[PDB]
Design a protein around this ligand. Structure first.
Ligand SMILES: NC(=O)c1ccno1
Ligand SMILES: NC(=O)c1ccno1
Lengths: 215, 211
């Protein structure tokens, strides 16, 4: 079993849904996903979680005090604390495999301007902390990135390179477009060869970096 | 006045939520987002959406006849058809900016093994088609990637180096002080300090961005 806690000011957005990969995982008892409203650890009447940045700049920064209290209650020294951010280390397939063996993930969802950096630094003194980016784009907060991380990790939990080329299924002809004959041929070796070629051809066109080329 | 149609076999999972950025934009009438259940266009009582891959192998491939019908109904000549897939061109900030000014986005969510390639190939003869990956990892399907694309695009709708650490009150917290420069009132010095913090963080976390 794995435990995933998600902490956010948008709990409804993160609520697990039965008809999904994580929903199935939960229903199969392979993971328990709990979502927590950050505002649960506020004290003021207006339940404030952010404040203007020191030193100036646009937007707001999430308060360290509120987060400090939330992670105190939720994390232990065994927790892997995940903090999605466009400024993070890259989250990759290797990361997903690694996190798929973790007992307890806690995902701190905050606006992209940041949680006050002292939260992560403080946490780092008692648990492992991973600030990570799921890609080279900006989201308003870590919520959608949390959903992506959960999806990528859970499909790897026991009991649940190059680009893959095109795939086909029935019928063999459709709207005047035919399935590549080799795929119909039953010749496993020629098919493996064809798919390896297609894969390399797609990779060089769409992701030349993966093959050690420019752009 | 952007229209986004999403097609998926998991419509609940993708149902917009009021308490979220997309929900706020929807509530503010800056975008219309429609979620369509792909099974509306299935032909059999079993409501079949995929089938075994030609040439063999594990997994399933989504049926072209079903997707062909769905896209025929939903897409127009002005549509930009988005297909999230780990085999796609990279989706980046530049992409999100481009797509932010589109009139009609249709996002086709499929399992990662793929939609029969003829669907995209056929659609591309009467509309613009973009197969894109949101990152170097595999998801079971394009659903979560659709959410990310929608978040990245919508926050840009009128309506480098990494960013360094940020701080707010209180000035001292659990033994840690906000960098005094930030309180100095020397705004040119602050900008230079932030640049150096950005450089150091980029070196440490994303060396690839420096070349
Ligand atoms: N690129 C990202 O992972 C991200 C997280 C929050 N906002 O953007
Ligand atoms: N990396 C991706 O965008 C993706 C889409 C579906 N599965 O993975």
């Amino acid at each position: 079993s794995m435990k995933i806690d998600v902490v956010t000011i948008f709990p409804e957005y993160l609520q697990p849904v039965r008809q999904s990969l994580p929903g199935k995982a939960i229903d199969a008892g392979l993971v328990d996903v709990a979502v927590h409203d950050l505002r649960r650890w506020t004290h003021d009447v207006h339940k404030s979680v952010d404040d203007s940045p020191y030193g100036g700049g646009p937007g707001m920064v999430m308060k360290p005090t509120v987060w400090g209290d939330a992670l105190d209650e939720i994390c232990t020294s065994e927790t892997l604390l995940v903090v999605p951010t466009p400024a993070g280390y890259p989250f990759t397939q290797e990361t997903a495999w690694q996190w798929s063996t973790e007992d307890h993930l806690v995902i701190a969802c905050g606006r992209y301007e940041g949680i006050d950096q002292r939260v992560a630094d403080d946490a780092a003194t008692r648990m492992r902390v991973r600030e990570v980016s799921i890609g080279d784009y900006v989201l308003n907060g870590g919520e959608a990135a949390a959903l992506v991380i959960i999806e990528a990790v859970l499909r790897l939990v026991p009991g649940v390179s190059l680009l893959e080329g095109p795939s086909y299924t029935r019928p063999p002809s459709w709207r005047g477009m035919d399935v590549p004959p080799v795929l119909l041929s039953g010749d496993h070796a020629k098919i493996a060869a064809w798919r390896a070629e297609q894969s390399r051809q797609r990779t060089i066109e769409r992701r030349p970096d993966l093959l050690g080329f420019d752009s």
